[PDB]
Write a protein that binds this ligand. Sequence first.
Ligand SMILES: O=P([O-])(O)O[C@H]1O[C@H](COP(=O)(O)O)[C@@H](O)[C@H](O)[C@H]1O
Ligand SMILES: [Ca+2]
Length: 448
Amino acid sequence: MTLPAFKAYDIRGRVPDELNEDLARRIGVALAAQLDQGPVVLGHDVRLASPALQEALSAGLRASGRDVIDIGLCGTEEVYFQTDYLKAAGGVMVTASHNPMDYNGMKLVREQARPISSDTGLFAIRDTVAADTAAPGEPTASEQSRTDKTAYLEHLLSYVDRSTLKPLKLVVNAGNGGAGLIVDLLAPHLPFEFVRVFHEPDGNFPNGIPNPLLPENRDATAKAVKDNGADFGIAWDGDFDRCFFFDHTGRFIEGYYLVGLLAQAILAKQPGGKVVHDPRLTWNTVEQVEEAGGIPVLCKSGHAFIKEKMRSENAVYGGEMSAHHYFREFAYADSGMIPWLLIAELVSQSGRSLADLVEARMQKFPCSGEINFKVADAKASVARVMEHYASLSPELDYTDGISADFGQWRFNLRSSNTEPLLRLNVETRGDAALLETRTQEISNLLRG
Ligand SMILES: O=P([O-])(O)O[C@H]1O[C@H](COP(=O)(O)O)[C@@H](O)[C@H](O)[C@H]1O
Ligand SMILES: [Ca+2]
Protein backbone atom coordinates (compact mmCIF):
# COMPACT_ATOMS: atom_id res chain seq x y z
CA MET A 1 0.00 0.00 0.00
CA THR A 2 1.12 3.54 0.83
CA LEU A 3 1.99 5.20 4.12
CA PRO A 4 -1.41 6.22 5.56
CA ALA A 5 -0.05 9.16 7.55
CA PHE A 6 0.52 11.23 4.40
CA LYS A 7 -2.77 13.06 3.83
CA ALA A 8 -3.82 15.72 1.33
CA TYR A 9 -2.55 18.68 3.36
CA ASP A 10 -0.30 17.33 6.12
CA ILE A 11 1.05 14.23 7.84
CA ARG A 12 -0.98 12.75 10.67
CA GLY A 13 -1.10 9.29 12.14
CA ARG A 14 -0.99 7.05 15.15
CA VAL A 15 2.39 6.68 16.89
CA PRO A 16 4.34 4.49 16.38
CA ASP A 17 2.73 2.44 13.61
CA GLU A 18 1.80 5.30 11.27
CA LEU A 19 4.34 7.88 12.45
CA ASN A 20 7.51 7.50 14.51
CA GLU A 21 11.03 8.81 14.93
CA ASP A 22 12.46 6.72 12.07
CA LEU A 23 9.80 7.99 9.66
CA ALA A 24 10.32 11.53 11.00
CA ARG A 25 14.05 11.36 10.30
CA ARG A 26 13.40 9.99 6.81
CA ILE A 27 10.90 12.83 6.26
CA GLY A 28 13.66 15.29 7.15
CA VAL A 29 15.99 13.70 4.60
CA ALA A 30 13.30 13.71 1.91
CA LEU A 31 12.29 17.29 2.68
CA ALA A 32 15.88 18.51 2.27
CA ALA A 33 15.77 17.22 -1.32
CA GLN A 34 12.53 19.07 -2.15
CA LEU A 35 13.44 22.56 -0.96
CA ASP A 36 15.39 25.39 -2.47
CA GLN A 37 18.57 26.21 -0.58
CA GLY A 38 18.46 27.67 2.92
CA PRO A 39 17.81 26.63 6.50
CA VAL A 40 14.71 24.91 7.85
CA VAL A 41 12.59 26.19 10.75
CA LEU A 42 11.29 23.57 13.20
CA GLY A 43 8.71 23.98 15.94
CA HIS A 44 6.36 21.75 17.90
CA ASP A 45 3.13 21.72 19.92
CA VAL A 46 2.44 20.69 23.52
CA ARG A 47 1.99 16.94 22.91
CA LEU A 48 4.42 14.91 25.00
CA ALA A 49 5.90 13.08 21.98
CA SER A 50 6.24 16.14 19.72
CA PRO A 51 9.81 17.14 20.78
CA ALA A 52 11.23 13.72 19.91
CA LEU A 53 9.62 13.83 16.45
CA GLN A 54 11.11 17.30 15.95
CA GLU A 55 14.54 16.08 17.03
CA ALA A 56 14.29 13.24 14.50
CA LEU A 57 13.30 15.68 11.75
CA SER A 58 16.28 17.79 12.74
CA ALA A 59 18.66 14.81 12.62
CA GLY A 60 17.56 13.92 9.10
CA LEU A 61 17.65 17.52 7.87
CA ARG A 62 21.12 18.04 9.30
CA ALA A 63 22.38 14.73 7.89
CA SER A 64 21.36 16.24 4.54
CA GLY A 65 23.34 19.44 5.12
CA ARG A 66 20.43 21.69 6.15
CA ASP A 67 20.95 24.16 8.96
CA VAL A 68 18.05 23.91 11.40
CA ILE A 69 16.43 26.85 13.21
CA ASP A 70 14.71 25.38 16.28
CA ILE A 71 11.97 27.80 17.42
CA GLY A 72 10.84 25.44 20.20
CA LEU A 73 7.37 25.01 21.64
CA CYS A 74 5.17 27.26 19.53
CA GLY A 75 2.02 27.70 17.52
CA THR A 76 1.81 26.59 13.94
CA GLU A 77 1.62 30.22 12.83
CA GLU A 78 5.02 30.84 14.44
CA VAL A 79 6.54 28.25 12.13
CA TYR A 80 4.91 30.07 9.21
CA PHE A 81 5.97 33.49 10.43
CA GLN A 82 9.56 32.54 11.21
CA THR A 83 9.99 30.57 7.97
CA ASP A 84 9.04 33.68 6.02
CA TYR A 85 10.66 36.26 8.31
CA LEU A 86 14.00 34.47 8.44
CA LYS A 87 13.92 33.79 4.67
CA ALA A 88 14.25 30.08 5.36
CA ALA A 89 13.98 27.36 2.73
CA GLY A 90 11.03 25.85 4.57
CA GLY A 91 9.59 24.84 7.90
CA VAL A 92 7.89 22.02 9.74
CA MET A 93 5.46 22.26 12.64
CA VAL A 94 5.08 19.05 14.65
CA THR A 95 1.45 19.09 15.74
CA ALA A 96 -1.24 16.53 16.61
CA SER A 97 -4.06 19.07 16.46
CA HIS A 98 -7.09 17.40 18.11
CA ASN A 99 -6.27 13.82 17.12
CA PRO A 100 -6.12 11.20 19.92
CA MET A 101 -3.41 11.00 22.57
CA ASP A 102 -1.46 8.35 20.62
CA TYR A 103 -1.41 10.45 17.42
CA ASN A 104 0.87 13.16 16.08
CA GLY A 105 1.57 14.89 12.80
CA MET A 106 3.42 17.52 10.84
CA LYS A 107 2.59 20.51 8.67
CA LEU A 108 5.24 21.36 6.09
CA VAL A 109 5.94 24.60 4.22
CA ARG A 110 8.58 25.83 1.78
CA GLU A 111 9.79 29.36 1.02
CA GLN A 112 7.55 32.22 2.20
CA ALA A 113 5.63 29.57 4.20
CA ARG A 114 3.99 28.33 1.00
CA PRO A 115 2.14 25.04 1.66
CA ILE A 116 3.60 21.65 0.79
CA SER A 117 0.57 19.50 -0.04
CA SER A 118 -0.09 16.09 -1.58
CA ASP A 119 0.30 17.36 -5.16
CA THR A 120 2.98 19.98 -4.40
CA GLY A 121 5.65 17.84 -2.76
CA LEU A 122 4.08 15.91 0.11
CA PHE A 123 3.42 12.73 -1.87
CA ALA A 124 6.85 13.08 -3.44
CA ILE A 125 8.27 13.14 0.08
CA ARG A 126 6.07 10.15 0.99
CA ASP A 127 7.36 8.16 -1.98
CA THR A 128 10.98 8.99 -1.14
CA VAL A 129 10.47 8.05 2.51
CA ALA A 130 8.71 4.83 1.50
CA ALA A 131 11.63 3.63 -0.65
CA ASP A 132 14.41 4.93 1.64
CA THR A 133 16.47 2.07 3.14
CA ALA A 134 19.71 4.07 3.40
CA ALA A 135 21.76 4.10 6.56
CA PRO A 136 21.24 7.34 8.52
CA GLY A 137 24.08 9.71 7.78
CA GLU A 138 25.66 11.85 10.42
CA PRO A 139 25.05 15.61 10.78
CA THR A 140 26.84 17.91 8.33
CA ALA A 141 24.99 21.06 9.44
CA SER A 142 24.19 22.80 12.68
CA GLU A 143 21.11 23.56 14.74
CA GLN A 144 20.47 26.97 16.28
CA SER A 145 17.93 27.59 19.04
CA ARG A 146 15.88 30.70 18.22
CA THR A 147 13.78 31.66 21.24
CA ASP A 148 13.27 35.31 20.31
CA LYS A 149 9.62 36.12 19.58
CA THR A 150 10.10 39.91 19.35
CA ALA A 151 9.57 40.20 15.59
CA TYR A 152 6.52 37.91 15.78
CA LEU A 153 4.99 39.88 18.66
CA GLU A 154 5.70 43.20 16.94
CA HIS A 155 4.07 41.86 13.80
CA LEU A 156 0.89 40.81 15.65
CA LEU A 157 0.61 44.20 17.34
CA SER A 158 1.11 46.01 14.03
CA TYR A 159 -2.47 45.11 13.03
CA VAL A 160 -4.01 47.42 15.66
CA ASP A 161 -3.66 51.03 16.77
CA ARG A 162 -2.85 50.39 20.41
CA SER A 163 -3.80 53.94 21.45
CA THR A 164 -7.37 53.26 20.30
CA LEU A 165 -7.77 50.11 22.37
CA LYS A 166 -10.05 50.14 25.39
CA PRO A 167 -9.54 48.03 28.56
CA LEU A 168 -11.99 45.33 27.51
CA LYS A 169 -12.38 42.30 29.75
CA LEU A 170 -11.54 39.26 27.62
CA VAL A 171 -11.86 35.60 28.53
CA VAL A 172 -9.00 33.64 26.99
CA ASN A 173 -9.08 29.84 26.87
CA ALA A 174 -5.97 28.05 25.59
CA GLY A 175 -7.54 24.69 26.41
CA ASN A 176 -4.12 23.69 27.83
CA GLY A 177 -2.62 24.08 24.37
CA GLY A 178 -0.03 26.68 23.55
CA ALA A 179 -1.97 29.93 23.09
CA GLY A 180 -1.49 31.23 26.63
CA LEU A 181 2.23 31.82 26.15
CA ILE A 182 1.55 34.30 23.35
CA VAL A 183 -1.39 35.95 25.16
CA ASP A 184 0.89 36.52 28.15
CA LEU A 185 3.66 37.96 25.97
CA LEU A 186 1.15 40.30 24.31
CA ALA A 187 -0.55 41.39 27.53
CA PRO A 188 2.05 43.96 28.75
CA HIS A 189 1.45 45.79 25.45
CA LEU A 190 -2.36 45.83 25.62
CA PRO A 191 -4.89 47.42 28.00
CA PHE A 192 -7.18 44.40 28.23
CA GLU A 193 -8.18 42.65 31.44
CA PHE A 194 -7.69 38.93 30.83
CA VAL A 195 -9.65 36.13 32.47
CA ARG A 196 -7.47 33.06 31.89
CA VAL A 197 -9.20 29.66 31.51
CA PHE A 198 -7.34 26.36 31.02
CA HIS A 199 -4.32 28.53 30.52
CA GLU A 200 -1.28 26.42 31.35
CA PRO A 201 0.19 24.27 28.56
CA ASP A 202 -0.24 20.63 29.51
CA GLY A 203 0.08 17.83 26.94
CA ASN A 204 -1.62 15.51 29.40
CA PHE A 205 -4.77 17.56 28.76
CA PRO A 206 -6.48 17.44 32.18
CA ASN A 207 -9.45 19.29 30.61
CA GLY A 208 -9.60 17.35 27.36
CA ILE A 209 -7.74 17.59 24.07
CA PRO A 210 -8.16 21.21 22.86
CA ASN A 211 -11.20 21.47 20.59
CA PRO A 212 -13.51 24.47 21.21
CA LEU A 213 -16.06 23.05 18.75
CA LEU A 214 -17.06 20.24 21.14
CA PRO A 215 -20.04 21.50 23.20
CA GLU A 216 -18.57 20.61 26.60
CA ASN A 217 -15.37 22.49 25.71
CA ARG A 218 -17.33 25.37 24.17
CA ASP A 219 -19.35 25.74 27.38
CA ALA A 220 -16.25 26.35 29.53
CA THR A 221 -15.54 29.57 27.63
CA ALA A 222 -19.20 30.61 27.59
CA LYS A 223 -19.49 30.12 31.35
CA ALA A 224 -16.36 32.16 32.05
CA VAL A 225 -17.68 35.00 29.88
CA LYS A 226 -21.09 35.08 31.56
CA ASP A 227 -19.78 34.64 35.11
CA ASN A 228 -17.23 37.45 34.75
CA GLY A 229 -19.19 39.89 32.61
CA ALA A 230 -16.51 39.75 29.94
CA ASP A 231 -16.83 41.77 26.76
CA PHE A 232 -16.09 38.63 24.76
CA GLY A 233 -14.26 35.33 24.98
CA ILE A 234 -11.64 33.71 22.77
CA ALA A 235 -10.72 30.04 22.65
CA TRP A 236 -8.06 28.34 20.54
CA ASP A 237 -7.21 24.92 19.27
CA GLY A 238 -4.02 23.41 20.66
CA ASP A 239 -1.60 24.88 18.10
CA PHE A 240 -3.67 28.13 18.05
CA ASP A 241 -4.04 28.56 14.28
CA ARG A 242 -7.81 28.46 14.90
CA CYS A 243 -9.65 30.83 17.18
CA PHE A 244 -13.25 30.87 18.32
CA PHE A 245 -15.32 33.78 19.58
CA PHE A 246 -17.97 34.07 22.26
CA ASP A 247 -20.00 37.26 22.67
CA HIS A 248 -20.83 38.91 26.00
CA THR A 249 -23.93 36.70 26.33
CA GLY A 250 -21.75 33.60 26.10
CA ARG A 251 -23.05 32.78 22.62
CA PHE A 252 -20.54 31.08 20.34
CA ILE A 253 -20.35 32.99 17.06
CA GLU A 254 -20.57 30.73 14.00
CA GLY A 255 -17.35 31.14 12.03
CA TYR A 256 -19.08 32.18 8.79
CA TYR A 257 -19.88 35.58 10.30
CA LEU A 258 -16.26 36.23 11.30
CA VAL A 259 -15.19 36.24 7.63
CA GLY A 260 -17.31 39.28 6.80
CA LEU A 261 -16.50 40.96 10.12
CA LEU A 262 -12.74 40.53 9.80
CA ALA A 263 -12.93 41.60 6.16
CA GLN A 264 -14.56 44.87 7.14
CA ALA A 265 -11.95 45.34 9.87
CA ILE A 266 -9.07 44.77 7.44
CA LEU A 267 -10.56 46.84 4.62
CA ALA A 268 -10.60 49.87 6.94
CA LYS A 269 -6.78 49.63 6.88
CA GLN A 270 -6.30 48.49 3.25
CA PRO A 271 -8.98 50.24 1.17
CA GLY A 272 -10.20 48.67 -2.06
CA GLY A 273 -8.49 45.38 -1.32
CA LYS A 274 -9.48 41.95 -2.49
CA VAL A 275 -10.83 39.42 0.00
CA VAL A 276 -10.80 35.71 -0.76
CA HIS A 277 -13.59 33.52 0.59
CA ASP A 278 -14.65 29.88 0.27
CA PRO A 279 -17.79 28.67 -1.55
CA ARG A 280 -19.59 26.95 1.34
CA LEU A 281 -21.29 30.06 2.73
CA THR A 282 -20.96 33.21 0.66
CA TRP A 283 -23.79 35.74 0.59
CA ASN A 284 -22.94 37.55 3.81
CA THR A 285 -19.24 37.82 2.99
CA VAL A 286 -19.88 39.11 -0.51
CA GLU A 287 -22.18 41.83 0.80
CA GLN A 288 -19.98 42.82 3.73
CA VAL A 289 -16.81 42.97 1.62
CA GLU A 290 -18.55 45.10 -0.99
CA GLU A 291 -20.13 47.32 1.65
CA ALA A 292 -16.63 48.00 3.03
CA GLY A 293 -15.31 48.84 -0.44
CA GLY A 294 -13.46 45.58 -1.07
CA ILE A 295 -13.68 43.06 -3.88
CA PRO A 296 -14.73 39.50 -2.95
CA VAL A 297 -12.94 36.63 -4.71
CA LEU A 298 -14.54 33.18 -4.67
CA CYS A 299 -12.07 30.32 -4.15
CA LYS A 300 -12.21 26.58 -3.54
CA SER A 301 -12.02 25.76 0.16
CA GLY A 302 -8.76 24.56 1.68
CA HIS A 303 -5.78 26.59 2.80
CA ALA A 304 -3.62 25.76 -0.22
CA PHE A 305 -6.20 27.00 -2.72
CA ILE A 306 -7.00 30.05 -0.58
CA LYS A 307 -3.35 31.07 -0.17
CA GLU A 308 -2.56 30.58 -3.85
CA LYS A 309 -5.61 32.64 -4.84
CA MET A 310 -4.73 35.38 -2.35
CA ARG A 311 -1.21 35.53 -3.79
CA SER A 312 -2.35 35.76 -7.40
CA GLU A 313 -4.88 38.49 -6.47
CA ASN A 314 -2.72 40.44 -3.97
CA ALA A 315 -5.67 39.85 -1.62
CA VAL A 316 -5.27 41.49 1.78
CA TYR A 317 -7.29 38.86 3.66
CA GLY A 318 -8.85 35.48 3.11
CA GLY A 319 -11.23 33.64 5.41
CA GLU A 320 -12.96 30.28 5.64
CA MET A 321 -16.12 29.65 7.60
CA SER A 322 -14.24 26.97 9.60
CA ALA A 323 -12.12 29.36 11.69
CA HIS A 324 -9.21 29.86 9.30
CA HIS A 325 -8.11 33.44 8.67
CA TYR A 326 -5.24 34.35 6.33
CA PHE A 327 -3.43 37.67 6.10
CA ARG A 328 -1.29 38.95 3.23
CA GLU A 329 1.12 40.79 5.54
CA PHE A 330 1.56 37.54 7.53
CA ALA A 331 3.10 35.78 4.52
CA TYR A 332 -0.44 34.91 3.37
CA ALA A 333 -0.63 32.51 6.31
CA ASP A 334 -3.28 31.79 8.89
CA SER A 335 -3.10 33.16 12.43
CA GLY A 336 -5.22 32.47 15.47
CA MET A 337 -3.89 35.66 17.08
CA ILE A 338 -4.43 38.39 14.46
CA PRO A 339 -8.23 37.80 14.39
CA TRP A 340 -8.93 38.50 18.05
CA LEU A 341 -6.65 41.55 18.03
CA LEU A 342 -8.66 42.95 15.11
CA ILE A 343 -11.99 42.16 16.79
CA ALA A 344 -10.83 43.71 20.06
CA GLU A 345 -9.86 46.81 18.10
CA LEU A 346 -13.23 46.95 16.32
CA VAL A 347 -15.19 46.67 19.59
CA SER A 348 -12.90 49.29 21.15
CA GLN A 349 -13.23 51.77 18.29
CA SER A 350 -16.90 51.33 17.42
CA GLY A 351 -18.43 51.20 20.89
CA ARG A 352 -20.49 48.20 19.75
CA SER A 353 -20.44 44.81 21.41
CA LEU A 354 -19.32 41.79 19.43
CA ALA A 355 -22.94 40.63 19.64
CA ASP A 356 -24.18 43.82 17.99
CA LEU A 357 -21.46 43.68 15.34
CA VAL A 358 -22.85 40.36 14.07
CA GLU A 359 -26.51 40.25 15.17
CA ALA A 360 -28.12 41.77 12.07
CA ARG A 361 -25.85 39.79 9.75
CA MET A 362 -26.88 36.53 11.41
CA GLN A 363 -30.54 37.46 10.98
CA LYS A 364 -30.01 38.56 7.38
CA PHE A 365 -28.12 35.44 6.26
CA PRO A 366 -29.00 32.58 8.63
CA CYS A 367 -27.12 29.39 7.96
CA SER A 368 -27.39 25.73 8.86
CA GLY A 369 -23.84 25.37 10.05
CA GLU A 370 -21.77 22.70 8.38
CA ILE A 371 -23.57 19.36 8.63
CA ASN A 372 -21.64 16.18 7.92
CA PHE A 373 -23.02 12.95 6.47
CA LYS A 374 -21.31 9.56 6.35
CA VAL A 375 -23.24 7.76 3.61
CA ALA A 376 -22.84 4.50 1.76
CA ASP A 377 -22.45 6.15 -1.66
CA ALA A 378 -21.58 9.84 -1.73
CA LYS A 379 -21.95 10.15 -5.52
CA ALA A 380 -25.38 8.51 -5.58
CA SER A 381 -26.44 10.62 -2.59
CA VAL A 382 -25.43 13.90 -4.26
CA ALA A 383 -27.26 12.74 -7.39
CA ARG A 384 -30.45 12.16 -5.37
CA VAL A 385 -30.26 15.73 -4.08
CA MET A 386 -29.67 17.27 -7.51
CA GLU A 387 -32.42 15.26 -9.22
CA HIS A 388 -34.88 16.32 -6.52
CA TYR A 389 -34.22 20.02 -7.16
CA ALA A 390 -33.71 19.92 -10.94
CA SER A 391 -37.22 21.21 -11.66
CA LEU A 392 -36.42 24.44 -9.76
CA SER A 393 -33.57 25.26 -12.18
CA PRO A 394 -31.05 26.56 -9.61
CA GLU A 395 -27.92 28.34 -10.75
CA LEU A 396 -25.15 25.76 -10.40
CA ASP A 397 -21.48 26.33 -9.64
CA TYR A 398 -18.82 23.62 -9.42
CA THR A 399 -15.98 25.58 -7.80
CA ASP A 400 -15.94 23.19 -4.83
CA GLY A 401 -18.45 20.36 -5.00
CA ILE A 402 -21.86 21.69 -6.03
CA SER A 403 -23.24 25.11 -5.13
CA ALA A 404 -26.90 25.63 -6.04
CA ASP A 405 -28.46 29.10 -5.84
CA PHE A 406 -32.27 29.07 -5.85
CA GLY A 407 -32.76 32.80 -5.35
CA GLN A 408 -33.88 33.08 -1.73
CA TRP A 409 -31.75 30.15 -0.53
CA ARG A 410 -28.65 28.26 -1.60
CA PHE A 411 -26.55 25.31 -0.59
CA ASN A 412 -23.09 23.89 -1.04
CA LEU A 413 -22.52 20.15 -0.95
CA ARG A 414 -18.93 18.89 -0.88
CA SER A 415 -16.85 15.79 -0.45
CA SER A 416 -14.16 16.53 2.12
CA ASN A 417 -10.45 16.57 1.30
CA THR A 418 -9.63 15.59 4.89
CA GLU A 419 -12.31 12.93 5.60
CA PRO A 420 -14.44 10.59 3.43
CA LEU A 421 -17.62 12.55 4.20
CA LEU A 422 -20.22 14.76 2.55
CA ARG A 423 -20.49 18.25 4.03
CA LEU A 424 -23.62 20.37 3.64
CA ASN A 425 -24.03 24.12 4.14
CA VAL A 426 -27.32 25.96 3.59
CA GLU A 427 -28.15 29.66 3.90
CA THR A 428 -31.17 31.81 3.12
CA ARG A 429 -32.08 35.46 2.58
CA GLY A 430 -33.36 36.25 6.06
CA ASP A 431 -35.72 33.25 6.30
CA ALA A 432 -35.18 30.87 9.21
CA ALA A 433 -38.19 28.75 8.26
CA LEU A 434 -36.97 28.15 4.71
CA LEU A 435 -33.53 27.39 6.15
CA GLU A 436 -34.90 24.60 8.33
CA THR A 437 -37.28 23.06 5.80
CA ARG A 438 -34.64 23.00 3.06
CA THR A 439 -31.90 21.72 5.39
CA GLN A 440 -34.19 18.91 6.58
CA GLU A 441 -35.28 18.12 3.01
CA ILE A 442 -31.67 17.81 1.83
CA SER A 443 -30.73 15.79 4.93
CA ASN A 444 -33.51 13.29 4.18
CA LEU A 445 -32.31 12.94 0.58
CA LEU A 446 -28.67 12.41 1.63
CA ARG A 447 -29.66 9.71 4.14
CA GLY A 448 -31.94 7.94 1.66
O1 LIG B 1 -9.16 21.09 9.82
P1 LIG B 1 -7.82 21.72 9.52
O2 LIG B 1 -7.45 22.67 10.63
O3 LIG B 1 -6.77 20.62 9.39
O4 LIG B 1 -7.92 22.56 8.11
C1 LIG B 1 -7.79 21.91 6.91
O5 LIG B 1 -9.06 21.21 6.60
C2 LIG B 1 -10.18 22.16 6.51
C3 LIG B 1 -11.40 21.37 6.20
O6 LIG B 1 -11.27 20.82 4.92
P2 LIG B 1 -12.50 19.85 4.39
O7 LIG B 1 -13.82 20.60 4.51
O8 LIG B 1 -12.21 19.39 2.98
O9 LIG B 1 -12.55 18.61 5.30
C4 LIG B 1 -9.91 23.22 5.44
O10 LIG B 1 -11.01 24.14 5.32
C5 LIG B 1 -8.65 23.93 5.81
O11 LIG B 1 -8.38 25.01 4.84
C6 LIG B 1 -7.51 22.98 5.85
O12 LIG B 1 -6.30 23.66 6.22
CA1 LIG C 1 -4.80 23.88 14.53
